[PDB]
Design a protein around this motif. Sequence first.
Motif, PDB file in Angstrom:
ATOM      1  N   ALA A   1       0.833  -1.196   0.000  1.00  0.00           N
ATOM      2  CA  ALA A   1       0.000   0.000   0.000  1.00  0.00           C
ATOM      3  C   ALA A   1       0.873   1.253   0.000  1.00  0.00           C
ATOM      4  CB  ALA A   1      -0.926  -0.007   1.204  1.00  0.00           C
ATOM      5  N   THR A   2       0.382   2.313  -0.630  1.00  0.00           N
ATOM      6  CA  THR A   2       1.092   3.584  -0.640  1.00  0.00           C
ATOM      7  C   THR A   2       1.194   4.116   0.782  1.00  0.00           C
ATOM      8  OG1 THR A   2      -0.908   4.924  -0.929  1.00  0.00           O
ATOM      9  CG2 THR A   2       0.154   4.076  -2.914  1.00  0.00           C
ATOM     10  N   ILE A   3       2.290   4.802   1.081  1.00  0.00           N
ATOM     11  CA  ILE A   3       2.504   5.360   2.414  1.00  0.00           C
ATOM     12  C   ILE A   3       1.463   6.437   2.687  1.00  0.00           C
ATOM     13  CG2 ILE A   3       3.995   6.807   3.843  1.00  0.00           C
ATOM     14  CD1 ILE A   3       6.369   5.419   2.288  1.00  0.00           C
ATOM     15  N   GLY A   4       0.816   6.363   3.845  1.00  0.00           N
ATOM     16  CA  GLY A   4      -0.118   7.395   4.243  1.00  0.00           C
ATOM     17  C   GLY A   4       0.533   8.286   5.275  1.00  0.00           C
ATOM     18  N   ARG A   5       0.056   9.515   5.397  1.00  0.00           N
ATOM     19  CA  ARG A   5       0.609  10.421   6.390  1.00  0.00           C
ATOM     20  C   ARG A   5      -0.489  11.007   7.254  1.00  0.00           C
ATOM     21  NH1 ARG A   5       3.528  10.706   1.904  1.00  0.00           N
ATOM     22  NH2 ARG A   5       5.713  10.028   2.109  1.00  0.00           N
ATOM     23  N   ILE A   6      -0.185  11.167   8.536  1.00  0.00           N
ATOM     24  CA  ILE A   6      -1.112  11.769   9.478  1.00  0.00           C
ATOM     25  C   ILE A   6      -0.586  13.151   9.849  1.00  0.00           C
ATOM     26  CG2 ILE A   6      -2.272  11.574  11.684  1.00  0.00           C
ATOM     27  CD1 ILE A   6      -1.319   8.571  11.659  1.00  0.00           C
ATOM     28  N   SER A   7      -1.415  14.173   9.666  1.00  0.00           N
ATOM     29  CA  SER A   7      -1.011  15.512  10.075  1.00  0.00           C
ATOM     30  C   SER A   7      -0.819  15.579  11.588  1.00  0.00           C
ATOM     31  CB  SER A   7      -2.050  16.541   9.635  1.00  0.00           C
ATOM     32  OG  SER A   7      -1.735  17.813  10.170  1.00  0.00           O
ATOM     33  N   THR A   8       0.237  16.278  12.001  1.00  0.00           N
ATOM     34  CA  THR A   8       0.511  16.543  13.407  1.00  0.00           C
ATOM     35  C   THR A   8      -0.353  17.664  13.973  1.00  0.00           C
ATOM     36  OG1 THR A   8       2.147  18.256  12.934  1.00  0.00           O
ATOM     37  CG2 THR A   8       2.940  15.959  13.066  1.00  0.00           C
ATOM     38  N   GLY A   9      -1.063  18.382  13.101  1.00  0.00           N
ATOM     39  CA  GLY A   9      -1.777  19.589  13.495  1.00  0.00           C
ATOM     40  C   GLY A   9      -1.003  20.860  13.160  1.00  0.00           C
ATOM     41  N   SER A  10       0.317  20.749  13.072  1.00  0.00           N
ATOM     42  CA  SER A  10       1.159  21.897  12.721  1.00  0.00           C
ATOM     43  C   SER A  10       1.644  21.821  11.277  1.00  0.00           C
ATOM     44  CB  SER A  10       2.350  22.017  13.685  1.00  0.00           C
ATOM     45  OG  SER A  10       3.417  22.738  13.095  1.00  0.00           O
ATOM     46  N   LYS A  11       1.297  22.826  10.476  1.00  0.00           N
ATOM     47  CA  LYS A  11       1.782  22.907   9.100  1.00  0.00           C
ATOM     48  C   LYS A  11       3.306  22.946   9.018  1.00  0.00           C
ATOM     49  CE  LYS A  11      -1.067  24.697   5.718  1.00  0.00           C
ATOM     50  NZ  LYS A  11      -2.303  23.867   5.769  1.00  0.00           N
ATOM     51  N   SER A  12       3.924  23.681   9.941  1.00  0.00           N
ATOM     52  CA  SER A  12       5.377  23.767  10.026  1.00  0.00           C
ATOM     53  C   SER A  12       5.997  22.392  10.261  1.00  0.00           C
ATOM     54  CB  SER A  12       5.791  24.709  11.157  1.00  0.00           C
ATOM     55  OG  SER A  12       7.194  24.693  11.333  1.00  0.00           O
ATOM     56  N   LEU A  13       5.486  21.690  11.266  1.00  0.00           N
ATOM     57  CA  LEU A  13       5.996  20.367  11.596  1.00  0.00           C
ATOM     58  C   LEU A  13       5.710  19.373  10.468  1.00  0.00           C
ATOM     59  CD1 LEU A  13       7.486  18.514  13.423  1.00  0.00           C
ATOM     60  CD2 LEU A  13       5.383  18.255  14.758  1.00  0.00           C
ATOM     61  N   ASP A  14       4.516  19.453   9.888  1.00  0.00           N
ATOM     62  CA  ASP A  14       4.177  18.576   8.775  1.00  0.00           C
ATOM     63  C   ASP A  14       5.155  18.770   7.622  1.00  0.00           C
ATOM     64  OD1 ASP A  14       2.030  17.592  10.212  1.00  0.00           O
ATOM     65  OD2 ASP A  14       0.495  18.585   8.999  1.00  0.00           O
ATOM     66  N   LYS A  15       5.492  20.029   7.336  1.00  0.00           N
ATOM     67  CA  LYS A  15       6.410  20.328   6.252  1.00  0.00           C
ATOM     68  C   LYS A  15       7.767  19.676   6.503  1.00  0.00           C
ATOM     69  CE  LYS A  15       7.314  24.710   5.271  1.00  0.00           C
ATOM     70  NZ  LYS A  15       7.287  26.046   4.612  1.00  0.00           N
ATOM     71  N   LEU A  16       8.270  19.810   7.728  1.00  0.00           N
ATOM     72  CA  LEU A  16       9.540  19.190   8.112  1.00  0.00           C
ATOM     73  C   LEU A  16       9.526  17.663   7.934  1.00  0.00           C
ATOM     74  CD1 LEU A  16      12.373  19.513   9.490  1.00  0.00           C
ATOM     75  CD2 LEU A  16      11.186  19.291  11.662  1.00  0.00           C
ATOM     76  N   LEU A  17       8.369  17.065   8.185  1.00  0.00           N
ATOM     77  CA  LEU A  17       8.228  15.618   8.141  1.00  0.00           C
ATOM     78  C   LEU A  17       7.867  15.077   6.757  1.00  0.00           C
ATOM     79  CD1 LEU A  17       6.487  15.069  11.597  1.00  0.00           C
ATOM     80  CD2 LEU A  17       8.894  14.725  10.959  1.00  0.00           C
ATOM     81  N   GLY A  18       7.699  15.967   5.786  1.00  0.00           N
ATOM     82  CA  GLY A  18       7.338  15.557   4.445  1.00  0.00           C
ATOM     83  C   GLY A  18       5.845  15.340   4.283  1.00  0.00           C
ATOM     84  N   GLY A  19       5.049  15.936   5.165  1.00  0.00           N
ATOM     85  CA  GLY A  19       3.604  15.836   5.062  1.00  0.00           C
ATOM     86  C   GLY A  19       2.884  15.419   6.337  1.00  0.00           C
ATOM     87  N   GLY A  20       3.618  14.826   7.271  1.00  0.00           N
ATOM     88  CA  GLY A  20       3.012  14.275   8.476  1.00  0.00           C
ATOM     89  C   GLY A  20       3.777  13.024   8.852  1.00  0.00           C
ATOM     90  N   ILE A  21       3.346  12.329   9.902  1.00  0.00           N
ATOM     91  CA  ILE A  21       4.015  11.067  10.236  1.00  0.00           C
ATOM     92  C   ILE A  21       3.540   9.955   9.300  1.00  0.00           C
ATOM     93  CG2 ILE A  21       4.354  11.777  12.671  1.00  0.00           C
ATOM     94  CD1 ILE A  21       2.397   9.441  13.437  1.00  0.00           C
ATOM     95  N   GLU A  22       4.441   9.036   8.975  1.00  0.00           N
ATOM     96  CA  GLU A  22       4.177   8.023   7.950  1.00  0.00           C
ATOM     97  C   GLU A  22       3.670   6.700   8.497  1.00  0.00           C
ATOM     98  OE1 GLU A  22       7.799   7.465   5.679  1.00  0.00           O
ATOM     99  OE2 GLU A  22       7.391   9.205   4.411  1.00  0.00           O
ATOM    100  N   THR A  23       2.720   6.095   7.788  1.00  0.00           N
ATOM    101  CA  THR A  23       2.455   4.675   7.986  1.00  0.00           C
ATOM    102  C   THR A  23       3.675   3.882   7.493  1.00  0.00           C
ATOM    103  OG1 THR A  23       1.383   4.310   5.831  1.00  0.00           O
ATOM    104  CG2 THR A  23      -0.020   5.055   7.685  1.00  0.00           C
ATOM    105  N   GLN A  24       3.781   2.631   7.921  1.00  0.00           N
ATOM    106  CA  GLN A  24       4.920   1.776   7.561  1.00  0.00           C
ATOM    107  C   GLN A  24       6.246   2.320   8.079  1.00  0.00           C
ATOM    108  OE1 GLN A  24       4.551   0.498   3.341  1.00  0.00           O
ATOM    109  NE2 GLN A  24       2.521   1.463   3.381  1.00  0.00           N
TER     110      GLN A  24
END
Length: 220
Positions: free
Chosen positions: A1-24
């Motif tokens: 399955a394609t990697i999914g990402r969960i937003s942290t709530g912070s756009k800044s933090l999401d940007k640093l993480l490449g979109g949010g925290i990753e599944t897998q």
Amino acid sequence: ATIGRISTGSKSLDKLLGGGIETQAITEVFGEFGSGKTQLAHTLAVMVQLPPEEGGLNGSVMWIDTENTFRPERIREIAQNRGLDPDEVLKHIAYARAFNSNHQMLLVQQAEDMIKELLNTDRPVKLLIVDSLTSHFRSEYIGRGALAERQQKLAKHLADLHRLANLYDIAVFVTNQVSATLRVYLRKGKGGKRIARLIDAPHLPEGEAVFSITEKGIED
Ligand SMILES: COC(=O)c1cccc2[nH]ccc12
């Protein structure tokens, strides 16, 4: 399955993480007391329940708590301040207290049952939290006579977590205090803001994100 990402709530933090925290993946967040790491955990447990358009994965949560830091009332607050139903949001967080390191390891192993049960439903497990990864290991395995066994048990524990993340397309999120994991270090910034620094990511640039802690949990 394609990697999914969960937003942290912070756009800044999401940007640093490449979109949010990753599944897998295992995201491992370090910080001293008051750093925001547990607040980030609470925020993610709400965010993941949202649809993708709102930063979630329409998922449920499993939460392993080693030091009594889970706050249902904080979940309700974050949920309501983000327009969700606080009771529904709480019902979809499966909570387990881990009493010691053996128990913690067993809980991760046994989690696979619920994961399988929910897998092809409307609310598959998408987030597995271990808060915290090491408190019991640090307490139980003292001095150099105990190091070898501590590292081996921790290594196996991380391996079990990796397997669940990869096999069932789950974002594993663990907290810690100072591969195999994506490491994020939280520290106090200026004026009550927090700072996240990403370190040693194989395919994300190191960098920093400044974020706030609010009634919505984490946000810019
Ligand atoms: C109700 O929550 C659980 O039963 C649970 C939560 C997190 C990890 C777990 N491992 C086995 C049960 C379990």
